[PDB]
Design a protein around this ligand. Sequence first.
Ligand SMILES: CC(C)(C)[C@H](NC(=O)C(F)(F)F)C(=O)N1C[C@H]2[C@@H]([C@H]1C(=O)N[C@H](C=N)C[C@@H]1CCNC1=O)C2(C)C
Ligand SMILES: CC(C)(C)[C@H](NC(=O)C(F)(F)F)C(=O)N1C[C@H]2[C@@H]([C@H]1C(=O)N[C@H](C=N)C[C@@H]1CCNC1=O)C2(C)C
Lengths: 298, 299
Amino acid sequence: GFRKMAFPSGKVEGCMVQVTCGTTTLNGLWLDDTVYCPRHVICTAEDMLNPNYEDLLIRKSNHSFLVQAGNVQLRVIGHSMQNCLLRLKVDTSNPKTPKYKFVRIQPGQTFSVLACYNGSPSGVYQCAMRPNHTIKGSFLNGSCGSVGFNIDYDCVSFCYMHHMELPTGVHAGTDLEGKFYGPFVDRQTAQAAGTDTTITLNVLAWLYAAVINGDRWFLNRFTTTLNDFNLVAMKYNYEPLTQDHVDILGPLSAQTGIAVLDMCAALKELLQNGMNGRTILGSTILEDEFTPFDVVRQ
Amino acid sequence: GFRKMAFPSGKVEGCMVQVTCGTTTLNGLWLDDTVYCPRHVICTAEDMLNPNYEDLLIRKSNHSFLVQAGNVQLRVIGHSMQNCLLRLKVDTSNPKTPKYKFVRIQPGQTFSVLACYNGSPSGVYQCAMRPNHTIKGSFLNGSCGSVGFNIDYDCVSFCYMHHMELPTGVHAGTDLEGKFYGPFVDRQTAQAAGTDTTITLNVLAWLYAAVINGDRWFLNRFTTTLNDFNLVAMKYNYEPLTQDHVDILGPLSAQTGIAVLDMCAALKELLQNGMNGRTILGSTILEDEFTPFDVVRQC
Ligand SMILES: CC(C)(C)[C@H](NC(=O)C(F)(F)F)C(=O)N1C[C@H]2[C@@H]([C@H]1C(=O)N[C@H](C=N)C[C@@H]1CCNC1=O)C2(C)C
Ligand SMILES: CC(C)(C)[C@H](NC(=O)C(F)(F)F)C(=O)N1C[C@H]2[C@@H]([C@H]1C(=O)N[C@H](C=N)C[C@@H]1CCNC1=O)C2(C)C
């Protein structure tokens, strides 16, 4: 009784459309009278080596954008570029527009992804912004324009739009202002991320999830200092723990009766001695894509 | 890049309502002018061992059922009992009703669950119907009436309505005709899941996914017949493979060039010799809720 859960996607499904330029098709996000989509929709195998997007956009008209909201075609009455997105103005305002915000998420935070193909939603899953600013998604051909989001009350916080897959199989994209997460550019050329690390704050939160759910085999009577634990974190490619992070784990610490630095001693033991064929919440690996907030909500 | 993915939940979100009888509230599924919900909504510590549902139902008027679709109350116009569900006729037909059907999901097949509380959807996740007819869900108090479903093209196939949690932490419920999956009853009494077994068709799909992903340390050159693999599998509480299962794995065997029965011989050795601390797709435990359809669609 503890698993990856995505937000219900209906508020986002009502905003998904299909945007086509010539032979290139991807998904767009339709909010009020604006459609947001990745700008490389205007590209045709000049995806490579030299996308000069200013040169390629000046040569386009409104008429060269075919935007389809289901059966209906919306007419583009304007267009501008913002960073790596296009903002297409259309004559119709989406009646299904939810209360929404655009936010830029921090590494370690999680969001739900609505994977779309030809404007049509096909799956929903949870994932996280990695410390190296990639995401470990599931995106196939035609998935560009799919969005990541969180929902607070009735408000959809859009945080990700999908652009590309790196050769390691992880993914890269932008916020809804079109600025990439990480060092990447929307050009079909080989690009690497920085070396990733494990999200220590999330592993600790998931260890609290396990205690809350009856898995306590890994606890122990020892404890450790912050710097003592951080020395072990660095050896195993975990990111350092901050007093602010300890402060974030306060509510989970209270509800379980295990001080943060005690859980760190437990984690230190799991890194050093392995898990010895046992499981935690049904997993044989230390899970790092649940935030403290995700654990409390579940 | 393989991961569990749920169907987009919007088509079901627009059908979720709250149903309240006195002190007990749970979720209902509003399609056209019918609201479907577990019948134990009419109970009040009559839940204990022996609710007499026909007795409790005859003693209830339409006005005792408080049905709320978000902001607005819906008026219950009639009601009947179908197996372990109530069917509430309301005066309003749901304008958001999608194309739908009611299906009986089979052991081994997967579906998405929209977990709801007080008629408000809170999360979506994917589930397998286990061979012992339970599901390994994530349901808290108030989750009853949450539904599981698949979506084909534009049509929602409803297959599950949540009723209860068994002592091992797994969950039981019914199809949308109110017939329970498994030998369970909606009575708060001593009940236990049967012995689970492992969904072998899905473990084999997972090994194929691992081969597609470049991991093939577990392959060997032994051969096995279907019958000799099934005899070993049952010794380890694995489901035996059927004729149809071998056919279902055709696409993945063709894609990888590994004959179905050769992957069976790979699995047979894993069952008999363990993993010896090696990992498959990052895990020392064989996943059995990822279907051959999920592997095929995610490649
Ligand atoms: C994977 C590929 C080698 C093709 C390339 N990657 C690199 O060039 C890199 F090495 F720089 F990453 C790449 O993704 N693109 C090439 C080109 C865009 C993009 C693209 O096709 N986006 C798809 C949108 N529908 C979603 C992708 C497709 C497959 N799975 C996804 O997620 C732009 C960078 C303009
Ligand atoms: C777990 C409990 C000991 C309470 C009991 N279980 C057994 O009696 C068993 F052990 F027999 F299964 C049980 O579930 N119920 C008691 C009673 C219904 C049901 C119930 O409360 N359903 C909840 C619906 N809102 C969802 C559950 C709650 C907690 N987590 C869930 O999923 C009925 C069988 C009429």
